[PDB]
Design an enzyme around this catalytic site. Sequence first.
Site, PDB file in Angstrom:
ATOM      1  N   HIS A   1       0.749  -1.053   0.048  1.00  0.00           N
ATOM      2  CA  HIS A   1      -0.002  -0.113  -0.038  1.00  0.00           C
ATOM      3  C   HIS A   1       0.840   1.205  -0.073  1.00  0.00           C
ATOM      4  O   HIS A   1       0.319   2.440  -0.240  1.00  0.00           O
ATOM      5  CB  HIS A   1      -1.172   0.042   1.065  1.00  0.00           C
ATOM      6  CG  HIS A   1      -0.719   0.259   2.460  1.00  0.00           C
ATOM      7  ND1 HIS A   1      -0.214  -0.700   3.282  1.00  0.00           N
ATOM      8  CD2 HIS A   1      -0.405   1.429   3.201  1.00  0.00           C
ATOM      9  CE1 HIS A   1       0.043   0.022   4.662  1.00  0.00           C
ATOM     10  NE2 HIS A   1       0.102   1.370   4.195  1.00  0.00           N
TER      11      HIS A   1
ATOM     12  N   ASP B   1       0.361  -7.581   1.872  1.00  0.00           N
ATOM     13  CA  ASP B   1       0.758  -6.160   1.847  1.00  0.00           C
ATOM     14  C   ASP B   1       2.152  -6.199   1.867  1.00  0.00           C
ATOM     15  O   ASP B   1       2.856  -5.858   2.904  1.00  0.00           O
ATOM     16  CB  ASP B   1       0.063  -5.669   2.993  1.00  0.00           C
ATOM     17  CG  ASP B   1       0.074  -4.047   3.025  1.00  0.00           C
ATOM     18  OD1 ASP B   1       0.659  -3.554   1.665  1.00  0.00           O
ATOM     19  OD2 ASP B   1      -0.274  -3.418   3.804  1.00  0.00           O
TER      20      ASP B   1
ATOM     21  N   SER C   1       4.109   2.604   8.141  1.00  0.00           N
ATOM     22  CA  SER C   1       3.978   1.617   7.399  1.00  0.00           C
ATOM     23  C   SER C   1       5.122   1.144   6.237  1.00  0.00           C
ATOM     24  O   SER C   1       5.737   1.854   5.898  1.00  0.00           O
ATOM     25  CB  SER C   1       2.526   2.044   6.103  1.00  0.00           C
ATOM     26  OG  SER C   1       1.587   1.861   7.210  1.00  0.00           O
ATOM     27  N   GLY C   2       5.141  -0.297   6.378  1.00  0.00           N
ATOM     28  CA  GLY C   2       6.323  -0.875   5.425  1.00  0.00           C
ATOM     29  C   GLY C   2       7.508  -1.073   6.407  1.00  0.00           C
ATOM     30  O   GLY C   2       8.383  -1.702   5.837  1.00  0.00           O
TER      31      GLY C   2
HETATM   32  C1  LIG Z   1       0.733   5.233   2.860  1.00  0.00           C
HETATM   33  O1  LIG Z   1       0.135   4.349   4.105  1.00  0.00           O
HETATM   34  C2  LIG Z   1      -0.679   5.006   4.690  1.00  0.00           C
HETATM   35  C3  LIG Z   1      -1.574   6.121   4.469  1.00  0.00           C
HETATM   36  C4  LIG Z   1      -2.596   6.383   5.220  1.00  0.00           C
HETATM   37  C5  LIG Z   1      -2.960   5.819   6.208  1.00  0.00           C
HETATM   38  C6  LIG Z   1      -2.117   4.850   6.774  1.00  0.00           C
HETATM   39  C7  LIG Z   1      -2.426   4.130   8.142  1.00  0.00           C
HETATM   40  O2  LIG Z   1      -3.359   4.602   8.875  1.00  0.00           O
HETATM   41  N1  LIG Z   1      -1.643   3.235   8.509  1.00  0.00           N
HETATM   42  C8  LIG Z   1      -1.704   2.682   9.846  1.00  0.00           C
HETATM   43  C9  LIG Z   1      -2.810   2.426  10.669  1.00  0.00           C
HETATM   44  C10 LIG Z   1      -2.746   1.818  11.810  1.00  0.00           C
HETATM   45  C11 LIG Z   1      -1.591   1.234  12.231  1.00  0.00           C
HETATM   46  C12 LIG Z   1      -1.562   0.568  13.500  1.00  0.00           C
HETATM   47  N2  LIG Z   1      -0.700  -0.654  13.820  1.00  0.00           N
HETATM   48  N3  LIG Z   1      -2.326   0.900  14.490  1.00  0.00           N
HETATM   49  C13 LIG Z   1      -0.592   1.152  11.322  1.00  0.00           C
HETATM   50  C14 LIG Z   1      -0.583   1.696  10.106  1.00  0.00           C
HETATM   51  C15 LIG Z   1      -0.900   4.454   6.092  1.00  0.00           C
HETATM   52  O3  LIG Z   1      -0.204   3.300   6.187  1.00  0.00           O
END
Ligand SMILES: COc1cccc(C(=O)Nc2ccc(C(=N)N)cc2)c1O
Length: 223
Positions: A41, A85, A176-177
């Site tokens: 993503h 993912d 993320s990632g």
């Molecule tokens: C480009 O990537 C992104 C764009 C917009 C939003 C997210 C996002 O909310 N990620 C995310 C949410 C919750 C957790 C968690 N462990 N609580 C981890 C990651 C995003 O990754």
Amino acid sequence: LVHGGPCDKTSHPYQAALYTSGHLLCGGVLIHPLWVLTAAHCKKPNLQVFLGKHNLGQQESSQEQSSVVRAVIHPDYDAASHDQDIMLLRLARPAKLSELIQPLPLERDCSAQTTSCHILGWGKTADGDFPDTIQCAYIHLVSREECEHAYPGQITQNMLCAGDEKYGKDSCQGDSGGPLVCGDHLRGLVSWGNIPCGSKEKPGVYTNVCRYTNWIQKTIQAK
Ligand SMILES: COc1cccc(C(=O)Nc2ccc(C(=N)N)cc2)c1O
């Protein structure tokens, strides 16, 4: 990353920062001098990878920047469910290794015994702001049964859950990632979870890296 603190300067040489349009987008993991692993993503136009960074706000002598020549998304990635993912990025300029730039080995055993785990990144902190300095937190893997009760019908075998009962230390948007490190091996990648971020009840959801050993090797050894 929420409820953590700044990392030790020399403890994250595998951490990558992913940029698009001059803004931080995601984290990533260096796994080979030519390859960075991240979440699917995080796919955006013309990604720029920064290695050997600690503080995003300043130019650091240890940093190395590279454009991406190839982005390989897992063939079974499903955006709506976050299943599978995972994505491999081939660097234009292979990583010049140093004390501050080193690859992290993958965890290959899905039944690996419990080890100390940690997460890291430049994502959203407790106050809702994005930090210049990389954050870190110790977390624990959560049983699959507990995670399935937290997210009914959303947890597949390609996902692993982790969190912290005491303060709810958790990864967040911008992380993320990035890596979930258990016993000096890559165990997972930050994928999704609780919004607002916090893992006291709904643990963080991570891509289960041990499931992708064959696909990673086949992509890296292709052509
Ligand atoms: C480009 O990537 C992104 C764009 C917009 C939003 C997210 C996002 O909310 N990620 C995310 C949410 C919750 C957790 C968690 N462990 N609580 C981890 C990651 C995003 O990754």
